Amino acid sequence: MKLNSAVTASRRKCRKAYFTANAETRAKMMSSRLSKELRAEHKIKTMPIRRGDIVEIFTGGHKGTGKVVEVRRRDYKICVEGINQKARNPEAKPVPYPIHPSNCIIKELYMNGSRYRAIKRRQERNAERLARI
Amino acid sequence: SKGTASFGKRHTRIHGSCRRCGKHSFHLQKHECASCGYPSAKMRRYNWSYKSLRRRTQGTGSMSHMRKVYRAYNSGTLKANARKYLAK
Amino acid sequence: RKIRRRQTRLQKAKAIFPCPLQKLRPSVTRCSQKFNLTQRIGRGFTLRELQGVGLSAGKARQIGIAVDPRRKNKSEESVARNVARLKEYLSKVTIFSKQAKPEEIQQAIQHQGVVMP
Amino acid sequence: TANKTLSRKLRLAKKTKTNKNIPRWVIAKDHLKKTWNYKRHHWRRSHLKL
Amino acid sequence: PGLKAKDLVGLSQEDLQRKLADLKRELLSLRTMKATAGPERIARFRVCKKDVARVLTVINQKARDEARAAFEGAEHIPKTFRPRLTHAMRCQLTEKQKRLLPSKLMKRKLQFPKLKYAVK
RNA sequence: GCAGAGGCCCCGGGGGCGAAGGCGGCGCGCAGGCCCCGCCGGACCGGCCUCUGGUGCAGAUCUCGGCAGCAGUAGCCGCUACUCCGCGCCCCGGAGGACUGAGGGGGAGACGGGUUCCGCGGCGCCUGCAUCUGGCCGCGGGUGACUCGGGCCUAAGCGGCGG
RNA sequence: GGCGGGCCUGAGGCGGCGGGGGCGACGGGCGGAACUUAAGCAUAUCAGUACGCCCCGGAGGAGAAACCAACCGGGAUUCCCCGCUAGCGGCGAGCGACGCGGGAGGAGCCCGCCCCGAAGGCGCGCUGUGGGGCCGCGAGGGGGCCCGAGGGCCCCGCCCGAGAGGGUGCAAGCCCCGUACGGCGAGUAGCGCUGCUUGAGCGUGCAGCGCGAAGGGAGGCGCGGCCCUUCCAAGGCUAAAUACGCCCCGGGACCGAUAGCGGACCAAGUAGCGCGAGCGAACGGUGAAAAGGACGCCCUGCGGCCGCUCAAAAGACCUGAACCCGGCCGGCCGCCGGCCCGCCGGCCCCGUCUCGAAACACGGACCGAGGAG
RNA sequence: GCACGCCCCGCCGGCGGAUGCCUCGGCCCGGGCGGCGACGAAGAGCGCGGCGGAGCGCGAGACGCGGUGCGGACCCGCCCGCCCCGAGAAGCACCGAUCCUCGAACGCAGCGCGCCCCGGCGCCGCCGCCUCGGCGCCUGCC
């Protein structure tokens, strides 16, 4: 259970905090599972979703793999290239079907440099925890 | 001619905007504000109306300075205070 | 309120870790012919009682004995009661000085509750 | 009224520039669903400064 | 895209004063253009407005730094440079004044110092 | 019977193989009420035991919200008034016939309203019939002073003054 | 009479520093009601309340006995538990303390007076200065079937110092976030007269005016003696335990949109109203994703029609009741009973006061929600 | 008789917003703080966004600016602007400034008018200081 009083366990307080959260917190909330292959390489269970990430949806209808073309933190959803609603008119511009990032597994990551620096900081912090704190 | 004709002979501005409270409460003839109380230094607050006090008081505006200084007291305003008490 | 008073009490205890929170107070006959048989704790030891042990009021306060100049013993038996209480406390008290003596201070054990109840 | 005061004119002027509709692009950006200002006044019915 | 304050920090006040006038003439030009034209998104307009602010922050910071140094270690210093404090903190007795005790009282404190003690 | 609380619901109560709710139809109960079926609906809901209460409505010139019949009813009876033609709307243009009748249904100011003024586009509202009209709606504009007025000075008055 | 200085009172100017005003609570000071209760109404009660004014502070006030008591005695103040009754009151209605005892918390002091006499804070002062909290990491789930989509089911597993929660296309310990586990003493006392007040009663405290001490105060029935216990007023400070709103944080056997704050709605003290003081609303919900409507047919055109998207139109919105109304179909009809079912028989309109209501008594158009031991 | 009006054997459709279900809101009880102001508060007015009305937020340096420590890709429309082991989107904590008109409100008014040598120019105290006034107390003179 929770032994800390500072964190709220109220449904009302929790939903308001998620529904209206700062963008820094929206990022962590919008994390996604690193693949078995990536996890072995980087030693991090889940990394926050980015706009160059290629991800494989594993539950929702539309279970394919694509790059993340757009991230809309306000809608708490990400848009994956190639997963769209059926464009009624054939000669029409596609509308992306937003997928939640929980429903996805990160096949590839946009390596960047800050991503690499962030991956390392966790690797040493997790090592302190693995050293039984 | 008690009502309509009497209301038709109205074309005057008894009340005017207040300097301090920006309301149509400043009597032009008496030179006093019905709500603001200006030109009195102290403001007009009467505990007969809870609602009137709530309509204009602290928290009914930007609270600019107070907010900024209250935030500082949960930060380094208190360290500055300690330094002054001891030497400077 | 109960948790608050304990927390204030715990904080105060640490500030004077060797010293007991409560000062020594005197046994005093409870007032009135109703309770004249029993004894309770009073504000402070009379100057005569402290003189009987041989402690000045200021020296006594440092040891931990509260001093009340106002109180008058009203008896010779009352003085004997308190002088004996003062004598026992003097034996129970240990003065830790010698600048810092941390090893002795670590095992000092703070007395808890009213002293000599 | 043609003999007005600059201070009175300034407060009346703000009301004229403020009595405007929600910009259509604002409705689109915030997804308003309530496109009526409700703070918009009309010279025939509304009495400003009353 | 606006002049980094790091670059203005590294300048002379006369160059900063000249730069501000040029930005202000540009600000007039953008204002004339936007009104005359019937739009290009006027992206420089927004950037210029921030870069008239950036340059003037630098010019204040230089002036405050020069003035504060002149008014230093002197009784009676310009109020703006005075410690922030608060109205009540400014008016509160110094801790040395609050601790100030009568000579007879101090003599007793020395005569009977705090003693550390423990009881069974 | 209601709405919560603590338990139970013998592999751990009932639910997208359709919850609550609504609509009709049985069945049980002296009745308060319950149950099941069909249909809609679309995610929650109970039975028993113990506990709690802001716990059951035909009324109170009850409160609030909806809305019926009267009823296509009463009425749209001030200011003498319109007509023809143009493509023609009650708008506009020409031609007639009127009217307000210089204490004007004229032209202007003080006040009060505060942009209503103007030009262009439109009618979704409003114009209590209509509208292509408009004081309505959208857009873009419009108030220039050495001599006019404020300011100025005093009037009734009002403040201010060692106190 | 003119003229220079010192003092003592006063002016004008400059500096340095402070004061002013704000907060619907708590805290102090003052002014101060009435409705009410007394089954009337004056004293009383309400109530030392509302309200008016004036000051603080994080607390404020109070505070180290001119104390209580009557003893095999205590010993500053504040808050708590008890005492609940001693008393007071048209002795009516009502009102009403404290002292013991148990606790929280405890801390003591300083001036004048007097001794020195500038030793001082030295432009002053001998008309006396000075001394005596942040920053983190963070476990472990698959297959089958189906569903618009599992977080559903059916089999098997894994992590619990984590099965508190929230999100995610349905009900998720293992999908995401988190959680458990971390790190860094004199115009006075008194007294006379008045007034207010108090439980205080021949005075509980205060105040005016008059008069005014010296060893005085008190001990709850006045006065004059005699004691006995107890204390030292007319100067000052003082922490703690206690109170409490805005604001922030957390929890709830709380309310669920006519409720809960007036206000759950990007714009509520808002829109509006009153010359003004002041008053004061209404308004929650599409869907998982706007995918917010493909096309064609026509129409002078509007608009219609198909259909489309979607699990569904859920189409300006969840469910969509009652009242009320339009089509189409079916009957001739209020209720109760018998029957095949339109005939016979019986039925006044409720509620409510009232001796008595169908009453030419009163309230009631209708329906929904709210509504009172 | 038909129509009407009723009633409904049922079948659809309006009109309304009840009922459920939900819920970033209230209320309730604890904590915790106790932190405004002439260095200009509380409040008020006017402005400020590339497209900009309300609200929020700012103040002509305006829908923000500088510094530091984090953070690391966005920015609800259209943008244009970023994107890169640092290059720096959203976000966050602090700190330094700017801060129009009113307002205790401060040259005088309230939106108009002075003074003054350029700094400014309100009141009330306290303490020094400067210029002085007195047939107050005297002293020195003539």
Side-chain angles (χ1 to χ4, degrees), chain B residues 8-73:
Chain B
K9 322 146 176 5
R10 86 177 107 174
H11 41 262
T12 355
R13 252 163 64 244
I14 285 173
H15 277 117
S17 285
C18 211
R19 243 192 263 180
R20 159 205 276 172
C21 85
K23 234 157 106 179
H24 212 234
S25 314
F26 195 82
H27 208 106
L28 292 199
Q29 225 157 3
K30 302 169 164 200
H31 302 99
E32 312 266 327
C33 215
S35 113
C36 342
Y38 191 70
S40 168
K42 7 136 12 157
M43 297 227 3
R44 241 202 26 148
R45 340 275 335 133
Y46 285 127
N47 313 294
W48 36 264
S49 35
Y50 23 28
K51 301 200 275 320
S52 117
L53 256 43
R54 105 172 54 138
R55 284 160 199 162
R56 190 189 55 243
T57 19
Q58 230 154 68
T60 75
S62 180
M63 252 178 116
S64 12
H65 193 70
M66 291 186 78
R67 265 170 337 134
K68 150 243 166 137
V69 156
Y70 274 36
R71 215 199 354 178
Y73 196 86

Side-chain angles (χ1 to χ4, degrees), chain D residues 24-43:
Chain D
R24 292 127 52 103
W25 58 269
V26 168
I27 305 160
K29 171 184 5 135
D30 312 288
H31 317 284
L32 251 129
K33 107 124 164 35
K34 282 165 47 176
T35 81
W36 164 233
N37 222 293
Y38 92 48
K39 281 243 209 353
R40 271 204 105 212
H41 67 81
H42 197 242
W43 64 276

Side-chain angles (χ1 to χ4, degrees), chain C residues 2-117:
Chain C
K2 189 194 241 249
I3 339 265
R4 208 242 321 272
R5 259 104 121 266
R6 296 203 245 94
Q7 256 42 254
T8 329
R9 218 171 275 117
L10 253 118
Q11 289 342 281
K12 217 233 148 162
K14 277 194 303 288
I16 20 119
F17 172 67
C19 324
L21 285 124
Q22 243 90 272
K23 281 183 144 100
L24 189 73
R25 311 271 166 179
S27 272
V28 125
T29 257
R30 310 210 207 147
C31 336
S32 295
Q33 185 62 286
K34 176 156 180 231
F35 314 101
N36 226 31
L37 358 125
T38 49
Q39 325 282 319
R40 58 147 145 100
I41 236 168
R43 136 169 232 95
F45 287 78
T46 302
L47 285 199
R48 165 141 161 169
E49 310 183 315
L50 298 153
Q51 142 187 345
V53 120
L55 262 183
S56 116
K59 311 190 327 238
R61 290 184 215 272
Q62 295 177 261
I63 310 271
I65 299 125
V67 169
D68 190 32
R70 244 178 328 235
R71 220 190 112 229
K72 307 284 178 275
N73 307 321
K74 264 124 226 256
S75 255
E76 331 264 13
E77 359 269 286
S78 148
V79 202
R81 222 200 284 110
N82 291 317
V83 157
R85 256 188 79 94
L86 252 158
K87 270 167 178 17
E88 285 171 58
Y89 183 65
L90 279 195
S91 355
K92 308 303 121 237
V93 93
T94 323
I95 302 286
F96 288 81
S97 275
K98 226 239 230 92
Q99 302 280 297
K101 236 340 261 120
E103 158 237 33
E104 288 299 305
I105 258 117
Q106 278 145 39
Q107 52 214 344
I109 298 309
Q110 187 161 12
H111 183 41
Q112 303 293 331
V114 23
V115 187
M116 300 188 41

